[PDB]
């Protein structure tokens, strides 16, 4: 498959007044790993991140064109973008290529810049949006991530517990996938700060 060509995993998780997004760090070509510091999570404003898994080229390209349109948005209007709006923007961007799609399944995680209400979503390769109140996943180890997230996720979690949960989910899901891993990175974001961590992970 095309999506499995580079592999990779991206997850987002809701908390109390916080939100989390994580991704593995491997960039490989089929069986061969090329790099272990590949960026799959991109800041799209303060307290609003997007996660892209799938074909590495389209990860980078979608990220870049997204930053393009986003910057134009934040210039024309005098405000940072709302999460729903970013989701609709990405959806539009992906559906423009309905018959020649980018091979990425984006995940959005952020807090409403006006309020603080956490928001998460995921999209098709052709931009079908899906919002949940618990978690979203995308990647070559989707079934694994589903398995972990359905068993670990509690509703009203505090930053520390959200962290531990999303970290354990990502680690244990990725460790049952050959083309995902070589490290994990987690952004846990709340109203006042953003914590970025790299997990101690297997490198095989």
Partner 1 sequence: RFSPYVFNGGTILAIAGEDFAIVASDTRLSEGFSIHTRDSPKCYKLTDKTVIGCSGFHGDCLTLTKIIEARLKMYKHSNNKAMTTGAIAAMLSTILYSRRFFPYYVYNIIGGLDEEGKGAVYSFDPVGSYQRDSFKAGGSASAMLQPLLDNQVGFKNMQNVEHVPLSLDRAMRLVKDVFISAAERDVYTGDALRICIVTKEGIREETVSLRKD
Partner 2 sequence: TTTLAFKFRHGVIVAADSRATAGAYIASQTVKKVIEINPYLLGTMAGGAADCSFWERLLARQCRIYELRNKERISVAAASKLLANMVYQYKGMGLSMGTMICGWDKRGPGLYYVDSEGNRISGATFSVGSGSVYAYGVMDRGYSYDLEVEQAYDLARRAIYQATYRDAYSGGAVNLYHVREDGWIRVSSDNVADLHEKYSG
Partner 3 sequence: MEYLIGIQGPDYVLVASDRVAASNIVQMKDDHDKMFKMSEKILLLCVGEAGDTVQFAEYIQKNVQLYKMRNGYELSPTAAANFTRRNLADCLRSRTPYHVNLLLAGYDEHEGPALYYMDYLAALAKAPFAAHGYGAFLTLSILDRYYTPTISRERAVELLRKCLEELQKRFILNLPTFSVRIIDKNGIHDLDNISFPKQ
- Residue 49 touches partner 3, criterion: CB under 8 A: no
Smallest distance, partner 1 to C-beta of residue 47, A: 28
DSSP 82-147: PHHHHHHHHHHHHHTTTTS--SB--EEEEE-SSS--EEEEEE-TT--EEE-SSEEEEETTHHHHHH
Residue closer to partner 3, measured from CB, 80 or 138: 138
- Residue 148 touches partner 1, criterion: CB under 8 A: yes
- Residue 38 touches partner 3, criterion: CB under 8 A: yes
Phi, psi angle pair for 6, to nearest 5°: -115, -20
> Which range, of 57-65, 70-78, 117-125, 167-175, touches partner 3 by CB under 8 A?
57-65
The rounded distance, in Å, linking the Cα atoms of 61 and 40 is 12
- Residue 151 touches partner 1, criterion: CB under 8 A: yes
- Residue 23 touches partner 3, criterion: CB under 8 A: no
The pairing of strands 41-43 and 118-123 is unpaired
- Cβ contact 7:182 at 8 Å: no
Smallest distance, partner 2 to C-beta of residue 198, A: 14
Residue ranges in 160-189 that form contacts with partner 1 under rule CB under 8 A = 168, 171-173, 175-176
- Residue 6 touches partner 3, criterion: CB under 8 A: yes
**Which residue bears the tokens 């990725």?**
174
> Which range, of 70-78, 92-100, 119-127, 140-148, touches partner 1 by CB under 8 A?
140-148
Residue closer to partner 2, measured from CB, 89 or 179: 179
C-alpha distance from residue 5 to each of 27, 77, 142 (Å): 10, 39, 15
Residue closer to partner 2, measured from CB, 157 or 185: 185
- Residue 203 touches partner 3, criterion: CB under 8 A: no
Residues paired with 191 in a beta bridge: none
The pairing of strands 135-139 and 9-14 is antiparallel
Binding site for partner 3 (CB under 8 A): 5-6, 27, 29, 32, 34-35, 37-38, 55-57, 60-61, 100
């Amino acid at each position: 498959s095309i999506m499995s060509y580079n592999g990779g995993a991206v997850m987002a998780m809701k908390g109390k007044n916080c939100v989390a997004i994580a991704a593995d760090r491997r960039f490989g070509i089929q069986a061969q790993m090329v790099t272990t510091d590949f960026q799959k999570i991109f800041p799209m404003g303060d307290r609003l991140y997007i996660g892209l898994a799938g074909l590495a080229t389209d990860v980078q390209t979608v990220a870049q064109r997204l930053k393009f349109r986003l910057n134009l948005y934040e210039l024309k209007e005098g405000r940072q973008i709302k999460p729903y709006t970013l989701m609709s923007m990405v959806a539009n961007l992906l559906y423009e290529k309905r018959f020649g799609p980018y091979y990425t399944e984006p995940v959005i995680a952020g807090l409403d810049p006006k309020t603080f209400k956490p928001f998460i979503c995921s999209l098709d390769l052709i931009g079908c949006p899906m919002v949940t109140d618990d978690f979203v996943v995308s990647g070559t180890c989707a079934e694994q991530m589903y398995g972990m997230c359905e068993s670990l996720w509690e509703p009203n979690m505090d930053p520390d517990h959200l962290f531990e949960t999303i970290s354990q989910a990502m680690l244990n899901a990725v460790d049952r996938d050959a083309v995902s891993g070589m490290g994990v990175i987690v952004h846990i974001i709340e109203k006042d700060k953003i914590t970025t961590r790299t997990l101690k992970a297997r490198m095989d």
